[PDB]
Amino acid sequence: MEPRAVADALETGEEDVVMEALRAYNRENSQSFTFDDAQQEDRKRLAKLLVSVLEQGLPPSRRVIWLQSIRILSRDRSCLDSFTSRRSLQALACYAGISASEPLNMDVVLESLKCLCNLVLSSPVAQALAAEAGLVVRLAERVGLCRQSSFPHDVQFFDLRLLFLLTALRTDVRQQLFQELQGVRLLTRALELTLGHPELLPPQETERAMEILKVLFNITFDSIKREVDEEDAALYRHLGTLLRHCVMLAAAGDRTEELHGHAVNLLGNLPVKCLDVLLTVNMDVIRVLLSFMEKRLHQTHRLKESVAPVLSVLTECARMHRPARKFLKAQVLPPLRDVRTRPEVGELLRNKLVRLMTHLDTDVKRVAAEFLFVLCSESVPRFIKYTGYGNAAGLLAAR
C-alpha cells in the first residue's frame, strides 16, 4: 500500500509477499506519475533496494512486475539518480536485448525500453551512460532487421523513441548513427518498408513513420555538406521520393497534418539539388505543400517552427525550377487589378505574408522576404511593388 511498507516488505520478506506487494502497488499506481513530497526518503530507499536487486540479477519468472515497478519509481526525479548507474543500465540493456554482452519476453523488452526512455529523457547522466555503452548500435541493428523481424508495434515504436531521445540529447550518438553506422540509408529503408501503395496509413504505422522522421531530422540537419557524392545523392533522392509519397499520403486518426509537418521538416534539411524529386503541369505536390503552408499560417505561438521549413522548401523549389517559380507566382502573387489596396492591408495570402514580413522574429521576416523575392523571379522592382518598402527594407538591408 504505502512506499515505506513496500520497502520494509522487500527488506524483510519472503518470495511470495514481496511479489504480492509489488503487484498490488503496480495495480494501484499504474495511473500515477506524481507523488507527495513526504515519502521521499522511503521512495529513495526502495529505489536503492530495487537497484541492488537489479544489479544482482532478476529471475526470469519475476521481471515484468519488477521492471514496471521500477518504471513507477522512474517517475520520480528524486529517485531517478538511484537508478542511473552503469551496472543498472547494463542490466536494463541486457533485459532489453540491446547490450553488446537467450529467450526474450516482449513485455520484458517493452518495459525495459520504457524505463530506458524515461531515464534518458530525465537524466543527463543516464543519456551519457547510454552514449558510453553504445546501445545505439544494437538499436539500429534491431531497427534495420525489419524484414525477418516480427517484433510488435510497441517494441518498434519505443526503439524509435529511444533512438530519437539518444540522437536529440547526445551529439556523439547522433554523429555515430550518421557517419559510422550509415543510419540514413537504414532509416530510409525502414520508412520505405513502413509505407509499403496503401491509400490510408494505419495508426501504428503513422506513429512509427513519424518517429522515423523525427530521428532522421535529429541526425540530418548539420551533418550534410554543401556538395554530396553520387551515392549520397541517390539515397537522398530515394528519401525525397518517400517523403513526396508521404506528403501525398493521408494518415488515419487525423494525424495527416502532423505527418506532413514532420515530412516537410525533414525535407527542409535535405540538399537543395535533391529537391528535384518533388517535381518528377504536374504540380500536385507543390499544391499540397502550398495548402499545408496556408493552413500552418494560422499558428501564432509556434509560427516559426511551423512555417519556416515549408517556406524554405518552397523557396528552394522556386529558385531551382522556373516552372515551379511561375506556378507559385501565379498562385501567390496574381496580376493586380485594383492597386488602391495596400499590401499590408487585407486578409488574403499576400496580406498575411506581408504582415509576417513584419513579425517579431527576424528569421521569419527574412524567410518570408526571400520566399517572396524568389517568387518574383528575383526582380527587385517587382518585389518592391508587391511587398512595399516598409516590408522589403529588411531584405534590402540584409544584402
Author numbering: 1 to 101, 107 to 201, 208 to 291, 304 to 422
Please quote the authors directly:
Apo Ric8A1–492 was subsequently crystallized, and the molecular replacement solution for this crystal structure was found using the structure of Ric8A in complex with MBP-Gαt327–350. As in the case for Ric8A within the complex, only a subset of the Ric8A1–492 residues (Ric8A1–422) could be modeled based on the electron density, suggesting that the C-terminal tail of Ric8A is flexible. Furthermore, comparison of the two structures shows that the binding of MBP-Gαt327–350 to Ric8A does not cause major conformational changes to its core domain, Ric8A1–422. In both structures, ~400 N-terminal residues of Ric8A were packed into a classical armadillo fold consisting of eight ARM repeats (R1–R8). Although residues 400–422 of Ric8A form a two-helix hairpin, their orientation and packing differ from those that characterize the armadillo fold. Moreover, in the structures of apo Ric8A1–492 and Ric8A1–492/MBP-Gαt327–350 conformations of the hairpin are nearly identical despite the different crystal packing interactions that involve residues 400–422. This suggests that the contacts within the crystal lattice are not responsible for termination of the armadillo fold after R8. Thus, Ric8A contains 8 ARM repeats rather than the 10 that were initially predicted.
